[PDB]
Design a binder for this molecule. Structure first.
Ligand SMILES: [K+]
Ligand SMILES: [K+]
Lengths: 109, 103, 109, 103
């Protein structure tokens, strides 16, 4: 799979709070197709070329769940990370994922 | 008006990331009655909660003193985190309801 | 001055690359009035309440020049930081500052 | 077509932040003729430039091999940084001109 694969990766995200980051390879095409926010960042008028992008306010597990959905259409939520995933989904304007997080929060212990 | 009041306050919370905190006075009785986590804690007088947003903590406390829930789009996720952290189910339910409505 | 003053500060920016950051207090009102990007971040539909905001891709000196302009209308460029200031000005959509950086680059050694 | 070509390459640059680099072959002669900084350097065969964007470095090199300048909005600032770093004034001028036009 291209998800979380260094093969052809044209961007790396350094995700998480300082001292507890994870570096995630990604593909600008898949991200921009899936999100108006990644589109703006990579293809929009104010896009700036950046090999490495920091996302200090997102949890790594959450970011990987978001990207899994953007590559595969699969939603792989877990109780421990669903709230952080909802933050990421709202942040990048991925509403199908946002909705699934809300339903998950409604129906989980 | 005991909410956020230094009068009779027996606990202070230092809330938020170091360098961007807010100190909030509170009353152990009121918190412990609304929360099993605060009960376990109180039953030190300065408590640091660097993982919680001050704005969310204040919304949680207002609920615990007044039973009033006042949510907004910019604070609901952080309030939900706090409500789950302190096990305040009525406030957590209200946040999830707000979120559903906002979809 | 309210510029870079902890008095009434309702946000703190942790500016710069990891290990070389500076924490800058600021006031959401002044920033949102001066920039559609800070407006979006603080007052817009997808605004999320955040005490501390990280800006890993901006230089601290540059960010302080940007904010000085937003508080005071004064532009205080220097050769050593003008390029990083132009990046910040483009990034937050402050065109009067962008223009001054370009003119400065044109007319400096 | 010696630009970005491993054929005869006597230097390799590891360009960009560690973990997000690109390795670019080059020819010391061509670089040294276009730049006082590269002249001083060459007159080791693997050079790390973690402060430069790969895309910008490639635009700089294309200029140095071909005299062609191909700028875009998303790469112009990073190209200007590189052009100033290696003291390539014609490319720096072109970037500032592009920026002026874009205002
Ligand atoms: K699944
Ligand atoms: K001045």
């Amino acid at each position: 799979s291209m998800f979380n694969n260094e093969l052809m990766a044209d961007v790396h995200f350094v995700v998480g709070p300082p001292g507890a980051t994870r570096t995630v390879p990604a593909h600008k095409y898949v991200l921009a197709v899936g999100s108006s926010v990644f589109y703006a960042m990579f293809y929009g008028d104010l896009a700036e070329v950046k090999s490495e992008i920091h996302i200090p306010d997102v949890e790594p597990a959450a970011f990987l769940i978001l990207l899994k959905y953007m590559y595969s259409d699969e939603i792989d939520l877990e109780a421990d990370t669903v709230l952080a995933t909802l933050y990421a989904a709202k942040k990048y304007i991925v509403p199908a994922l946002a909705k699934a997080c809300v339903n998950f929060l409604e129906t989980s212990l």
